[PDB]
Design a protein around this ligand. Structure first.
Ligand SMILES: O=C1NCC=CN1[C@@H]1O[C@H](CO)[C@@H](O)[C@H]1O
Ligand SMILES: O=C1NCC=CN1[C@@H]1O[C@H](CO)[C@@H](O)[C@H]1O
Ligand SMILES: [Zn+2]
Ligand SMILES: [Zn+2]
Lengths: 294, 294
């Protein structure tokens, strides 16, 4: 078991620990649960989904990286597919506040990047900040998304975001998690191609600047991230962040990072290049390349 | 009159135009109104504050810079001092979504930077995004801040941000707009000293990384910006943005920018350097220096 979970695990109910023991066994437990797994857990404990989800929060929170806040936040996105994805906040020393990732954004991207077509709900161990409520309203699930918090009745997003601002406000018809393929040809080595394919799924109706980032680990494993714009602009998820989310959730660490590539247009109104490099260097990765879309 | 206002102005009621004619006369009308001015306006039109504020929105919106969205948003912060500050969104081509500024952040910083001790209300021509609701909850006015939108009853922030996340959540006691002075000694030329003094007023209880940016225009005018952190991290206002807000609001343009300086600690957990330079270069400013706090 991945040391991160150690303590959390020790804190679970016996019947839960038992059901989990085998799953968390693998150090590379992918911070996610399939329907089947979920079902199994429900049988072993008497928990319902909602209560189960809350019960797991602490494992999700155990994946947090909070050098600054020391405030660990865990979230669980529930796929319409039945799969449940963990998510946790990340803070990067040597960068800026704008590079931070919220437990909520983590889980949702985890899901999205993983191929999830839509979410049904999200559970968080702490009420969501406004930035995250806004982020959520970009999804194809809209204001209907249900949100579960400890010691609270559940609610739809619309409740947490009254008189909401969103894509419609900008006359945008395609939502995040909707299907997209920008059609760029894949080229170069593996890393580049991963980066480009990531750009191909990017959500960028506002600026129209597709981008993607792919990271290669020491063991040759690869994590890639897609750009996701947001109607309110700022809460947009940069492509780098996507990759780092996967990387951390999947059990790796910064130092495991070998080289990275960023793909984007050269003539785009917005440019990820600087922020990607800077942050990566901050994390200690020095090999970064950029590939130009067309 | 500053060409930007041209059309807006043409759209105002006659008695309003009249009262304004003289104020807006100056090309460098500072996008702000003192109590006296306000009073005057009320007398000339029969408007009450709330209605007056709405009536002016279009001038505030006229200060917007929206190369991307083409979506002009105006806001008016009302000082407890009686002064009213304009605010408008800004989008920067060649940068990233995270560098964007919301009409709301503009007005509030305008006020804060100007020396305002606290706000009583804010009026916006469009419902606020979640990022801005969160930004607002960092202020010393808390959830009480009143928010006025067109065709809506007014409300407190708490209404737009139910079950809010904020500074208290992190056990923070000093709010934005509260009084602060970090006490760094001022040194170097004027520009540096402006930058450092800006850092001295910075709000950064979370990361403890004070920073400030000062810009020098062709005419030798100087605009400076203070760093303002936010409990939810991301909605934090970088120091550069502060300066650019002032610069644009006060009637200048990017090209008027001569040289810039950024002051910050070298050993700070967060670092503004990269983003500042990058964005400034994007705006076409090549002279940037950094000064190290101590
Ligand atoms: O992830 C969440 N969710 C609820 C509220 C805040 N945060 C995060 O919690 C820390 C405190 O802001 C930062 O890492 C930030 O991203
Ligand atoms: O300034 C505001 N206030 C209300 C909602 C959005 N925005 C802004 O409006 C444009 C559309 O998101 C961007 O410039 C963004 O900063
Ligand atoms: Zn959040
Ligand atoms: Zn906003």
């Amino acid at each position: 078991m991945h040391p991160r979970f150690q303590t959390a695990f020790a804190q679970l109910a016996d019947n839960l620990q038992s059901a989990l023991e085998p799953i968390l066994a693998d150090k590379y437990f992918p911070a996610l649960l399939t329907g089947e797994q979920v079902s199994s857990l429900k049988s072993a404990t008497g928990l319902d989904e909602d209560a189960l989800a809350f019960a797991l929060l602490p494992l999700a929170a155990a994946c947090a990286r909070t050098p600054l806040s020391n405030f660990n936040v865990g979230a669980i996105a529930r796929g319409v597919s039945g799969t449940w994805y963990f998510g946790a906040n990340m803070e990067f020393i040597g960068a800026t506040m704008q590079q931070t990732v919220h437990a909520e954004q983590s889980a949702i991207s985890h899901a999205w990047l993983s191929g999830e077509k839509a979410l049904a709900a999200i559970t968080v161990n702490y009420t969501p900040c406004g930035h995250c409520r806004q982020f959520m309203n970009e999804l194809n699930s809209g204001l209907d998304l249900r949100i579960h918090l400890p010691g609270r009745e559940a609610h739809a997003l619309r409740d947490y975001l009254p008189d909401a601002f969103g894509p419609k406000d900008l006359e945008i018809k395609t939502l995040l998690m909707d299907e997209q393929d920008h059609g760029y040809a894949l080229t170069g080595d593996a890393l580049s191609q991963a980066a480009i394919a990531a750009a191909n799924r990017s959500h960028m109706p506002y600026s129209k600047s597709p981008s993607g980032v792919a990271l290669e680990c020491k063991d040759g494993r690869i994590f890639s991230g897609s750009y996701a714009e947001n109607a309110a602009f700022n809460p947009t998820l940069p492509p780098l962040q996507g990759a780092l989310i996967l990387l951390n959730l999947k059990g790796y660490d910064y130092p495991d990072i070998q080289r990275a590539v960023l793909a984007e247009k050269a003539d785009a109104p917005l440019i990820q290049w600087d922020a990607t490099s800077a942050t990566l260097k901050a994390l200690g990765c020095h090999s970064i390349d950029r590939v130009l879309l067309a």
